[PDB]
């Protein structure tokens, strides 16, 4: 390799450079809390018929350990669009909090959810967060979503004056009053009512199908958790080059007993160099430090 | 890499590499000019001794 | 069950150095840091409540980008906390009630009197139990309840002097309401203490609530019964406590060998700072 670096089949004399050692992590140790309670997701996905787009029943499921199998039992999953994350890693990491807003939209605005294009949702009716860490799933249960008699209770507002702040529920009157004449709400033709219905009877086309659209809103980098699969906090190692996982953030290093003292709520121990080198277990008080491999 | 995917990763994580590269270019250029003036100062010190 | 007056009042003072809450669980040791969050100004010309008291207001408290609160007393003079927009069963209302047993939290849709209360004596029973429920008493179509240990020091605070001052930070980030408080051991006994302090973070509720017009309530000794004592006899003065308003500016922080804050300065101040 010295002949290789010198680009010749001979070397002269002395000291020459090459690669480093780069000791490898021997294993990986994950630290999770000791709380595992099963969670009934049958009360949030396959319940009765949900609301229209004019109301957002923003329901937050409580803290409950739930594997991906319960969500994965639903065959007619149809929506696959995401943003920077593949939809095949919904488990093995614990998220922050689930906002599973489950409601129904008209079937010809599924492709107009994305920003940069104003549709029936991206207009003044709704303002969505720009980052949109959460995803959209939309399965169809039209065997019982639409009654044979008809479902005319689904509404939407269309015309609005001002602008809404994103991540708000838009339920108000929002009436139209203009023109070159006194109207005062009872003018007649000067009304132009912004609220309109949908109607749902099972003789339709392709953009008229109801969907149980659940938008999942969450975030990242938040110390507790709400819903994740049952994964164990494996046994720890000492002075072992290891990939440690402190509920999220991982790294490669060895463990040392921390002589210094921390506050009970200040378990995180970042330094002036802005590196994580102090941690405790989520189950037990383990005043410890980490020095990288 | 925990977030993005190999069909979609490299188009986002390319500018990180370029930014680190140009930051090291600036640091190295500063190191050369500082080393040059320190070399001149050390030559002056050698002349003085 | 509602006894009210239509009289409010307000006072005025000048804070110097208060409102230092820990923003994260980091253990920074003997180093410095930059902080850009909602804080009280330094030498802030803050708003006071009247030093008298027993008195009785029905005030309107404006929530303006995070709210800092301070009260030094004995025997738990202040007991209730109502935050929200309108507090009349149409917007989300966060309710904090601090008894001696276990503090209770209700993020619910509750209408209110303009000054809800409860009157407690003993009256040959040795029980200052909740006999009056002049709060909402209806509209329980809500989706929150919580029970916690009382962080607040309880009734009948027999201590050496004005031994402890309660600082509170009510802060909201993306509908996430967090209470960062401190029951600090002050010993200066003269209005605003001239000193340095820090506030630990203890309460985080990611629920979802819009707060514009909030309030702070109490539960004290008026009558224990409607007809045993004359009503409308308590003047509009409330109690002696301080309210301050935060802002997102630049500040500098210094840590110690034990990881706590020993000094901090307002980076948006006179130019030496």
UniProtKB/Swiss-Prot annotation, chain B:
This is Spike protein S2'. Subunit of the fusion protein that is processed upon entry into the host cell. Mediates fusion of the virion and cellular membranes by functioning as a class I viral fusion protein. Contains a viral fusion peptide that is unmasked after S2 cleavage. This cleavage can occur at the cell membrane by host TMPRSS2 or during endocytosis by host CSTL. In either case, this triggers an extensive and irreversible conformational change that leads to fusion of the viral envelope with the cellular cytoplasmic membrane, releasing viral genomic RNA into the host cell cytoplasm. It comes from the Viruses. The chain holds residues 981 to 1029 of 1273 of the full protein. It comes from Severe acute respiratory syndrome coronavirus 2 (2019-nCoV). Changing residue 2 to A: In strain: Alpha/B.1.1.7.
């Amino acid at each position: 390799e010295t002949k290789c670096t010198l680009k010749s089949f001979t070397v002269e004399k002395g000291i020459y450079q090459t690669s480093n050692f780069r000791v490898q992590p021997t294993e990986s140790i994950v630290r999770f809390p000791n709380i595992t309670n099963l969670c009934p997701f049958h009360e949030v996905f396959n319940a009765t018929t949900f609301a229209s787009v004019y109301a957002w029943n923003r329901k937050r499921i409580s803290n409950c350990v739930a594997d991906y199998s319960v969500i994965y039992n639903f065959a007619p999953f149809f929506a696959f669009k995401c943003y920077g994350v593949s939809p095949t890693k919904l488990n093995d990491l614990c998220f922050t909090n689930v906002y599973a807003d489950s409601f129904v939209i008209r079937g010809n605005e599924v492709s107009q959810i994305a920003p940069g294009q104003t549709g029936n949702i991206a207009d003044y009716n709704y303002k969505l967060p720009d980052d949109f860490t959460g995803c959209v799933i939309a399965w169809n249960s039209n065997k019982l979503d639409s009654k044979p008699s008809g479902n005319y209770n689904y509404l939407y507002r269309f015309l609005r004056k001002s602008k809404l702040k994103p991540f708000e529920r838009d339920i108000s009157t929002e009436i139209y009053q203009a023109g070159n004449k006194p109207c005062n709400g009872v003018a007649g033709p000067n009304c132009y009512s912004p609220l309109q219905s949908y109607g749902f009877r099972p003789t339709y086309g392709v953009g008229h199908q109801p969907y149980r659209v659940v938008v999942l809103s969450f975030e990242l980098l938040h110390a507790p958790a709400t819903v994740c699969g049952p994964k164990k906090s494996t046994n720890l190692v000492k002075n072992k080059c290891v990939n440690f996982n402190f509920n999220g953030l991982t790294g490669t290093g060895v463990l040392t007993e921390s002589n210094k003292k921390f506050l009970p709520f200040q378990q995180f121990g970042r330094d002036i160099a802005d590196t994580t080198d102090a941690v405790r277990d989520p189950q037990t008080l383990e005043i410890l430090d980490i020095t990288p491999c | 890499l925990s977030r993005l995917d190999p069909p979609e990763a490299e188009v986002q994580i390319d500018r990180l590499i370029t930014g680190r590269l140009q930051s090291l270019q600036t640091y190295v250029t500063q190191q050369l000019i500082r080393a040059a003036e320190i070399r001149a100062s050390a030559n002056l010190a050698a002349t003085k001794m | 069950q509602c006894v009210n007056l239509i009289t409010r009042t307000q006072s005025y003072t000048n804070s110097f150095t208060r409102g230092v809450y820990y923003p994260d669980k980091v253990f920074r040791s003997s180093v410095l840091h930059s902080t850009q969050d909602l804080f009280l100004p330094f030498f802030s010309n803050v708003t006071w409540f009247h030093a008298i008291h027993k008195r009785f207001d029905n005030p309107a408290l404006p929530f303006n980008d995070g709210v800092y609160f301070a009260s030094t007393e004995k025997s738990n003079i202040i007991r209730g906390w109502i935050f929200g927009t309108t507090l009349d069963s149409k917007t989300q209302s966060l309710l904090i009630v601090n008894n001696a047993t276990n503090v209770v939290i209700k993020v619910c849709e509750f209408q209110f009197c303009n000054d809800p209360f409860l009157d407690v004596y003993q009256k040959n029973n040795k029980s200052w139990m909740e006999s009056e429920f002049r709060v909402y008493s209806s509209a329980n179509n809500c989706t929150f309840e919580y029970v916690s240990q009382p962080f607040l020091m309880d009734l009948e605070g027999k201590e050496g002097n004005f031994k402890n001052l309660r600082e509170f930070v009510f802060k909201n980030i993306d509908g996430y309401f967090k209470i960062y408080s401190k029951h600090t051991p002050i010993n200066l006994e003269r209005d605003l203490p001239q000193g340095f302090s820090a506030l630990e973070p203890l309460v985080d509720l990611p629920i979802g609530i819009n707060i514009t017009r909030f309030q702070t309530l109490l539960a004290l000794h008026r009558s224990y019964l409607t007809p045993v004592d004359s009503s409308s006899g308590w003047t509009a003065g409330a109690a002696a406590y301080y309210v301050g308003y935060l802002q997102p500016r630049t500040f500098l922080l210094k840590y110690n060998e034990n990881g706590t804050i020993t000094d901090a300065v307002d980076c948006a101040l006179d130019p030496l700072s």
